[PDB]
Amino acid sequence: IKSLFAVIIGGSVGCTLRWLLSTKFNSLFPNLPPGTLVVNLLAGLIIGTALAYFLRQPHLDPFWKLMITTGLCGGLSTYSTFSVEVFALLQAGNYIWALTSVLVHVIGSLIMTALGFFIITILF
Amino acid sequence: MIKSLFAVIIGGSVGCTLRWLLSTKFNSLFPNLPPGTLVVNLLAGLIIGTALAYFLRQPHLDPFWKLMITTGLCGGLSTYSTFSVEVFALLQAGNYIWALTSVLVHVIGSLIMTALGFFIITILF
Amino acid sequence: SVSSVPTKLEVVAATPTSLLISWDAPAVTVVHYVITYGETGGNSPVQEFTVPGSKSTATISGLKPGVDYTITVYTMYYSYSDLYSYSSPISINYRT
Amino acid sequence: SVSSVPTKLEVVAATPTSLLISWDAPAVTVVHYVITYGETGGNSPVQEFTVPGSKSTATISGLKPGVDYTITVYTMYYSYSDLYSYSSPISINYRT
Numbered sequence: 001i002k003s004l005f006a007v008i009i010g011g012s013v014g015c016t017l018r019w020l021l022s023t024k025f026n027s028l029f030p031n032l033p034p035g036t037l038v039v040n041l042l043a044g045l046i047i048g049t050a051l052a053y054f055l056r057q058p059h060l061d062p063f064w065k066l067m068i069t070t071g072l073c074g075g076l077s078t079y080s081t082f083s084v085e086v087f088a089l090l091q092a093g094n095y096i097w098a099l100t101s102v103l104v105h106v107i108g109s110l111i112m113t114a115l116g117f118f119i120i121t122i123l124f
Numbered sequence: 125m126i127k128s129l130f131a132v133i134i135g136g137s138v139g140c141t142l143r144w145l146l147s148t149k150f151n152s153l154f155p156n157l158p159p160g161t162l163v164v165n166l167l168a169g170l171i172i173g174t175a176l177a178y179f180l181r182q183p184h185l186d187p188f189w190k191l192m193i194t195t196g197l198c199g200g201l202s203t204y205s206t207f208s209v210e211v212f213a214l215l216q217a218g219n220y221i222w223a224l225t226s227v228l229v230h231v232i233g234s235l236i237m238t239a240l241g242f243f244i245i246t247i248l249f
Numbered sequence: 250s251v252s253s254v255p256t257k258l259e260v261v262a263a264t265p266t267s268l269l270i271s272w273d274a275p276a277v278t279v280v281h282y283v284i285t286y287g288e289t290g291g292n293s294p295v296q297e298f299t300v301p302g303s304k305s306t307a308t309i310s311g312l313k314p315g316v317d318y319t320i321t322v323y324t325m326y327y328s329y330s331d332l333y334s335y336s337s338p339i340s341i342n343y344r345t
Numbered sequence: 346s347v348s349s350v351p352t353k354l355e356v357v358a359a360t361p362t363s364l365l366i367s368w369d370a371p372a373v374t375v376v377h378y379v380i381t382y383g384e385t386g387g388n389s390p391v392q393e394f395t396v397p398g399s400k401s402t403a404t405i406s407g408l409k410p411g412v413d414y415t416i417t418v419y420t421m422y423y424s425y426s427d428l429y430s431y432s433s434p435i436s437i438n439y440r441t
């Protein structure tokens with residue numbers, strides 16, 4: 001039950017952030033909706049920094065780890081919205097941007113996770 | 125904005141809770157391609173695809189229900205961050221074949237499930 | 250805030266029994282455009298057909314010579330909030 | 346429920362001044378194994394070094410002949426709950 005609160009509090013903050021950023025920005029560039037990209041890139045950055053930080057602090061409460069990863073990063077990022085955007089582009093005959101969206105989300109999200117991990121490792 | 129916020133939170137909390145239970149229960153069974161994280165992304169792809177086809181045919185339904193299913197449930201259920209650390213960890217461990225396989229199966233798999241969701245409902249209608 | 254309705258609907262070429270129309274695409278992911286046409290005197294059934302999202306022209310055939318026609322165009326498009334939905338139409342009249 | 350500690354740590358080959366060790370990998374994504382070694386009589390500094398996750402053997406060199414050594418192996422690994430963390434060690438004694 002205490003673990004469930006961490007997932008819900010963290011998850012609700014993430015989903016709410018994703019909802020605000022997507023509705024505000026996605027329509028600016030429909031070929032690669034920037035709200036959905038930013039939330040995935042940002043979640044990649046946070047999980048990467050968590051990767052390096054939690055290693056160095058093995059005695060942190062599992063409540064805070066759960067709230068940041070499964071909660072916040074889980075609620076903030078999205079695979080389903082990434083799919084419909086690409087699916088819609090494929091149905092619209094826009095293959096060049098369907099491919100570009102897949103590469104930028106995947107390559108971009110791994111790069112942000114690498115930066116998060118190595119920035120904290122270089123500091124510590 | 126407050127009624128819309130409830131749809132996002134109720135739907136999102138159900139999705140996140142489902143992802144939390146399925147991942148902790150199943151991910152450890154096959155560490156090269158964690159099956160809990162795969163199933164939640166494939167399942168969210170299926171639901172958003174069926175929503176895509178269904179809501180088109182019922183254009184005047186409440187925006188509360190659309191928001192709760194897509195931004196809420198499918199948004200909370202699926203994950204890109206966990207997909208990244210799994211792949212990143214495999215790359216750091218020198219396990220390139222499974223890092224590639226994880227990327228292809230999540231992407232190709234999730235689009236296929238969205239297509240099935242859309243076309244099953246379109247074929248019924 | 251972004252409009253999903255097309256703009257500058259017009260007839261770029263005409264024969265007695267056909268019209269070639271064009272339009273500017275709206276700044277959204279259009280899956281298909283729906284073209285409707287019918288005789289402006291309203292005792293005649295309106296017909297429709299789709300064209301792919303990549304196209305911004307269409308040919309209408311099998312018309313009668315010397316008759317006023319009403320031609321409309323709307324989109325089926327993807328957006329973040331509404332997923333797949335239909336736009337409002339844009340409309341013009343043209344006499345063959 | 347899944348253990349991240351290696352099993353069956355053992356010396357498979359030995360000279361007077363070196364040891365070749367092996368172990369079974371745990372059922373988790375291991376990023377690297379950390380090998381530590383030092384003289385069992387505790388007035389001697391313990392040394393460590395890593396080996397890639399793909400490997401399950403290592404060579405220890407520059408040892409003194411006829412001396413008892415304590416050798417341990419632990420993992421740095423990925424799991425869903427804890428992300429990157431260190432396992433408990435598995436340990437053996439061996440006399441050159």
Ligand SMILES: CCCCCCCCCCO[C@@H]1O[C@H](CO)[C@@H](O[C@H]2O[C@H](CO)[C@@H](O)[C@H](O)[C@H]2O)[C@H](O)[C@H]1O
Binds near residue numbers: 091094
């Ligand atoms: C990597 C794995 C991915 C798996 C998922 C595959 C994606 C499935 C979506 C298919 O959607 C189709 O897309 C076509 C365009 O791409 C459309 O053609 C439409 O547009 C074409 C021109 O763009 C015309 O030639 C067609 O007649 C017209 O139906 C067609 O209707 C539509 O159903």
Ligand SMILES: CCCCCCCCCCO[C@@H]1O[C@H](CO)[C@@H](O[C@H]2O[C@H](CO)[C@@H](O)[C@H](O)[C@H]2O)[C@H](O)[C@H]1O
Binds near residue numbers: 111218397
């Ligand atoms: C494609 C999109 C972008 C991807 C993101 C960038 C790539 C991710 C970072 C990779 O991290 C490095 O991976 C090396 C290889 O796995 C590791 O080397 C380790 O493994 C090597 C191979 O066994 C050994 O030679 C090295 O000594 C040993 O440090 C190294 O520690 C680790 O920091």
Ligand SMILES: CCCCCCCCCCO[C@@H]1O[C@H](CO)[C@@H](O[C@H]2O[C@H](CO)[C@@H](O)[C@H](O)[C@H]2O)[C@H](O)[C@H]1O
Binds near residue numbers: 301
């Ligand atoms: C999991 C498997 C993944 C791969 C599946 C690929 C399937 C693609 C062919 C299916 O058949 C298409 O069905 C569309 C209807 O569903 C038709 O589109 C027509 O109707 C659409 C609207 O319903 C318009 O957007 C199109 O432009 C118009 O051609 C189209 O003619 C027809 O060929």
Ligand SMILES: [F-]
Binds near residue numbers: 080083166169202234
């Ligand atoms: F998905």
Ligand SMILES: [F-]
Binds near residue numbers: 033036081083086101
């Ligand atoms: F996308």
Ligand SMILES: [F-]
Binds near residue numbers: 040109204
């Ligand atoms: F991500």
Ligand SMILES: [F-]
Binds near residue numbers: 157206208211227
């Ligand atoms: F993964």
Ligand code: NA
Binds near residue numbers: 200203204
């Ligand atoms: Na999510």
